[PDB]
Amino acid sequence: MMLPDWKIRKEILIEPFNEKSLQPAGYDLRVGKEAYINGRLINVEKEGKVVIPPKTHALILTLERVKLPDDVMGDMKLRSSLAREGLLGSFAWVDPGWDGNLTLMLFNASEEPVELNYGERFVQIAFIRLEGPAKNPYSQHLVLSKR
Numbered sequence: 001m002m003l004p005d006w007k008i009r010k011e012i013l014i015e016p017f018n019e020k021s022l023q024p025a026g027y028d029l030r031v032g033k034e035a036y037i038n039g040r041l042i043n044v045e046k047e048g049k050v051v052i053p054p055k056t057h058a059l060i061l062t063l064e065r066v067k068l069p070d071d072v073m074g075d076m077k078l079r080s081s082l083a084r085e086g087l088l089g090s091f092a093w094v095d096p097g098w099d100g101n102l103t104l105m106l107f108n109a110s111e112e113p114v115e116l117n118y119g120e121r122f123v124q125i126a127f128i129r130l131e132g133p134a135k136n137p138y139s140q141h142l143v144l145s146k147r
């Protein structure tokens with residue numbers, strides 16, 4: 001089952017916690033301090049925004065650290081207005097036991113740049129309870145490694 005807002009507030013460490021981000025069954029993660037586009041690190045905190053060029057992907061760090069219990073899985077989707085403007089998120093599962101800020105990939109499929117402001121709500125994470133705790137459950141900066 002999915003956790004409602006009042007259980008998210010109790011069980012998931014989400015810091016810094018933004019009241020306006022809590023949704024009926026999820027939390028709107030915000031654009032954080034760092035992004036990475038076309039080989040270049042962007043200080044989003046300093047610049048106040050990140051601009052995703054047309055037909056280009058970007059890595060964006062969430063403002064929030066999220067810590068999941070060993071019996072909850074995190075499930076992210078882009079916010080609806082950003083999808084309408086041509087963004088697609090490429091998201092992995094957030095494993096039970098995860099603790100950290102998330103590095104999120106967004107692709108701008110449109111022919112026009114798309115801007116996101118520092119601190120803007122951009123991805124809603126929902127939380128799904130596991131039937132029992134994982135036998136083997138699973139961080140403040142962008143992850144920039146590749147295989």
Ligand SMILES: O=c1ccn([C@H]2C[C@H](O)[C@@H](COP(=O)(O)O)O2)c(=O)[nH]1
Nearest residue numbers: 091092093094095098102103104138
């Ligand atoms: O889009 C996503 C999805 C997940 N994670 C975090 C939480 C996951 O548990 C973890 C998986 O990392 P690996 O164990 O695959 O390297 O990464 C991200 O940073 N971005």
